[PDB]
Amino acid sequence: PNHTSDKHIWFQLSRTRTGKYTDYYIWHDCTHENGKTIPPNNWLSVYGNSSWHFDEVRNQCYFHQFMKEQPDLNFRNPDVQEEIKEILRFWLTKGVDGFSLDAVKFLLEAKHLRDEIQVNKTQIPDTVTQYSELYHDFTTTQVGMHDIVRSFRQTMDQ
């Protein structure tokens, strides 16, 4: 439930600011020039360099936990929760007896968008690229994720 592909119709509509789809993904302003992008903060991706990737159509940076081709959904928008519930109902009504949710700890992130604490305090800020070089307090296990899981359980209880 955490993310979709960049070829999904939701992302294609979101990147052009088309209706309620405009806010299914975490967008933010960023500075891109001469083939270089300045991210809003120093958050790092699990598999690589940065969690913020620039886009051309929207002229903004979107947020991805894992890869640049995996935009992360916005669970602070109730419409996304409604869509997830609809998908769950669609799969439940076909006879599936259970679900195994993957990567539930990555659902919510902090809204203040503050830098995370480095493990090596004296390391130069622009030479940090490994996911293991930062303490992840603002990107994993935020307040309200367990409520989302309980909402999923309540939906399945029907």
Ligand X SMILES: *[C@@H]1O[C@H](CO)[C@@H](O[C@@H]2O[C@H](CO)[C@@H](O)[C@H](O)[C@H]2NC(C)=O)[C@H](O)[C@H]1NC(C)=O
Binding region for ligand X (CB under 6 A): 48-49, 120, 122-123, 129
Closest CA relative to residue 49, chosen from 27, 73, 66: 66
List C-alpha distances in Å: 37 to 34, 94, 103, 157. 9, 45, 28, 46
Our finding on whether 141 is near its own copies (CB under 8 A) is yes
H/E segment holding residue 38 = strand 36-38
62 binds, among its own copies, ligand X, Ca ion, none (CB under 5 to 8 A by kind): none
Which CB sits closer to Ca ion, 32 or 48? 48
Q: How far is the CB of 24 from its own copies (least distance, A)?
A: 26
| Binds its own copies by CB under 8 A, chosen from 47, 91, 99, 135 | 135
Question: Half-sphere exposure of residue 17, counting CA atoms within 13 Å on the CB side?
Answer: 7
| Binds Ca ion by CB under 5 A, chosen from 1, 51, 71, 72 | 72
Which amino acid appears at position 120 of this protein? N
120 binds, among ligand X, Ca ion, its own copies, none (CB under 5 to 8 A by kind): ligand X
* Cα dihedral across residues 131, 132, 135, 141: positive or negative: positive
* Cα dihedral across residues 108, 128, 135, 38: positive or negative: negative
Which CB sits closer to ligand X, 59 or 120? 120
Our finding on whether 79 is near its own copies (CB under 8 A) is no
Which residues of this protein are in contact with Ca ion, per CB under 5 A? Answer: 2, 72, 107
